[model samples]
Target: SLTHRKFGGSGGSPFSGLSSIAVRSGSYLDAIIIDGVHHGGSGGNLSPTFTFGSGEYISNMTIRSGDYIDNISFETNMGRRFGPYGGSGGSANTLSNVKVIQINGSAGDYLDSLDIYYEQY
Candidate 1:
C-alpha cells in the first residue's frame, strides 16, 4: 500500500555547504552519501538529504516487506569523483543495492543541483 517515495531536504546539513550528506543518525536507518567532493577556496559543496524508512513494518507473520533503493539519490552530483555507498537497513527497510557518489571538488567550484537513484520492493 506504499507509493513511490520522493522525499528531500529532510536530513540536509544545517551547516550550509561542504558538509556531510547524512549525519549518521546513530541508527541503521540514518545512512547517506555525498556524490561529489568538497574542497575549499570558494563556493560550497552540497550533502544529500533524506529521512527514509518511515511507516515500514514486519509483522509476526515474518513477512519480509519494505521499501528498497537499488541505487538512488535525491540529488546526483557527477564531478571529479563518483561511486556508490551503502546506508543502514532494517525491518522497516529493504534495499536491493544502494549506491552513492562521494564528494570531490575544489577551489572556485560552486554547487548547483543535486541528484540520486534507488529502487523499491
Candidate 2:
C-alpha cells in the first residue's frame, strides 16, 4: 500500500516530460507494487521510463541532486513474463544492494533487501 508521484518543475518547464509510460495488463500482473523518488534539480531534465507489462515491481528507491528515475529494477524483473512488444518477468528479488546513486540513464534502483526469495531454478 504505497504510491507517490512527484513531478515538479517550474515556470520554465523545470521538469515533467515523460514522453512515454505505458503499463497495461489484464491477465499478467502479480506485481505493480513500488518504491519511489525522483528529486530532480538538474539530471539534464529527464524522461525515459516507458515500461509496459512483465509484471512491474519497483521495490525500493532514493534519489537526489538533479534526480532522475525510471530505471526499472523490479527486483531484477521478478518472475519475468510479458508477451507483446516487450515482456520479461522471471528472476528477481535476491539482491542485497540494488544500486544507482546518480543515474542519468540506465535503470537500476531498488533496495528493500529481500521481499523476494523464491528459488526453484
Candidate 3:
C-alpha cells in the first residue's frame, strides 16, 4: 500500500495526480489542475501546463508557506524542474525522493495549505 502524508494548512479538498498539472499563482497560489480536475481558488496568474514524460513521476517538491501557501515547485524522475510558483513570502519546505500520488489542500481567494500522498521511491 502507498503512504499518505501531508503538509501545510489542512484546508482544501483532496486532489489526485495525473499525467499533467496546471498551476495558477500570484502573491499566493491560486489554483491547480491535475489531469483536468480543478483545485484551489480562482485567482493568481495562469501558468503554462506541466505534463509528465512517459514513466516519469514527481521525485522532489518544495513548498513555501506561512499563514497561507506562498509557493510551490516540482522536480520529476526525468530530472526536469517545473516551478517555484507564487510569491516569495514564506519559509521553504522540501520533500524529496518520492512519487507523489495525490494532494489535499485548502483554498479560497488564495491557496491556504496542502496535504500530499505519496510512495517512497
Candidate 4:
C-alpha cells in the first residue's frame, strides 16, 4: 500500500524557506503468525520515503548545479538486516545515479523510515 502526507514547518526547515513536502510510505509488518505455530517471528518491511519535491528539492538542485554529492549517509534494513540507502539512477532533477534503499521484513514488525529522515534534519 501507499500513503502520503504534506510536510510542514513551511519556513523553518531548509533551503532558504520551506515550500512543502511529500511524505510517502509503502512499509508493512511481516507475518505475525503461522499455521499451528505458537507465534511467527517478527521483522520489518520497506519504510516510508519523503521526496522534497520543490521545497528542499529545488535547494538540492541548486546545490548540485555545480557540485556533486561526495558524501552521503546511506542506510537500510531487510528480512533480517542488510543493504544501504539509495541505488543507481537519475531523472530530470535528481542525483546522476541512485541506489535502491532496500528494507526487508520477515515476520511481525516494521520500521518507520520517516522518523529517521526528519529526526536527522
Candidate 5:
C-alpha cells in the first residue's frame, strides 16, 4: 500500500520533492539521508516545501558540508502548520546525518556545507 513521489526546494541541495515511501495514517517511521548537493547547489532545486502524503518520516540527514544559504527550512515530523505532541504528528518525512543548511529566508540554503533531505515510511 503506497503511491508515487514528489520533489522541490533548492540550496546546498535543491529540494527535488517528495517520494512514495508510505508511513500509514497512524504509524511512525524514519528518514535517512535524503538528497545531497554542494554550496548553493541542490539535488533537485525544486522548492522549499518537500510535501509528502500524510504520514511519512522526514528529517535533515546531511553529514557533509557545502554552502547552502540560510533560506533552507529545517523541519520534519511535527510540522508547524499542525498540532504538537504525540498521537498526531509526523507529516513531513525527511531526515539527515548532520543538518540542513539554511539561508535567512527561513528556507533551504547554505554557507559552506552540503544540504541534504531524506525520507522514509
Candidate 6:
C-alpha cells in the first residue's frame, strides 16, 4: 500500500519512480525531470542529471519550502546522495526510510508544492 502526503500547495501532475532525475534550479526549483520526463516551468541556472543504479530506490528526501519549494535532495537505498537543488530560502524538512513511489506537485516559475506517494520499507 502507498501513503500520499502533501507538501506546500496542491497543484501539478503526478510522477513515479526515481530511475532518472534532472533538476534545473537557481534560487528556486525551476524545473524537474523525472524518469526522463520534464515538469515545471523554465527558470534555473544549473541543470544536473542523476541516474540510479540497478536495484536502487529513493530512501530519503530533504526539502526546503516556504511560499514555494526552495530546495530538494534525495538519498538512495544504495547510500547515494543527490543535490539539495535550488537556493537556500525555506525551512528544512526531511523524510527518511521510505521508498518513494510517486510524486504530485505544482510548478510554474518555480516548483510550488509536492504531493509524495510512498511506502515504508
CA RMSD of all predictions: 16.5, 15.5, 8.7, 15.8, 16.7, 8.6
TM-score winner between 3 and 5, please give it.
3
For candidate 2, the 10 contiguous residues with the lowest summed lDDT are 62-71
- For candidate 2, the lDDT comes to 0.27
| Global Cα lDDT for candidate 4 | 0.23
Q: 1-121, model 4: which lDDT tens digit per residue?
A: 2344667666764442222221111222222221123122243333233332322222111001112111112222211211222222221233222223222223223221111111111
lDDT of 3 by residue, 2-108 (tens): 54467899886655456788888999788877786778777888888888776788889999999888889999989988888999998998889998877778877
In the range 16-50, model 5's lDDT, one tens digit per residue, is 23432211111111111233322222323233234
Question: Residues 1-121, candidate 2, lDDT per residue (tens digit)?
Answer: 2344656555553322222232222222211222234322221223334443333332333211112221233322344322221123333222333321122222223211212222222
Worst 10 residues of 5 by lDDT: 22-31
Q: Name the regions of candidate 4 deviating beyond 4 angstroms.
A: 14-104, 107-121
Q: Against the unseen true structure, what C-alpha lDDT does each candidate score? A: 0.27, 0.27, 0.83, 0.23, 0.28, 0.82
The TM-scores of all predictions, comma-separated, are 0.18, 0.20, 0.80, 0.16, 0.19, 0.81
Better of 2 and 5 by lDDT: 5
Candidate 5 CA-lDDT value: 0.28
| Each model's total of backbone clashes | 24, 10, 3, 15, 59, 0
Off by over 4 Å in 3: 1-17
Candidate 6 residues 41-82, lDDT tens each? 777865667887777778999999998889999999899988
lDDT (tens digit, per residue) of candidate 1 on 1-121: 2235455667853322233443122211122333233322231222244322222221111101124222212322221221122233423222332332223322222222122232222
Q: Using lDDT as the measure, which candidate wins?
A: 3
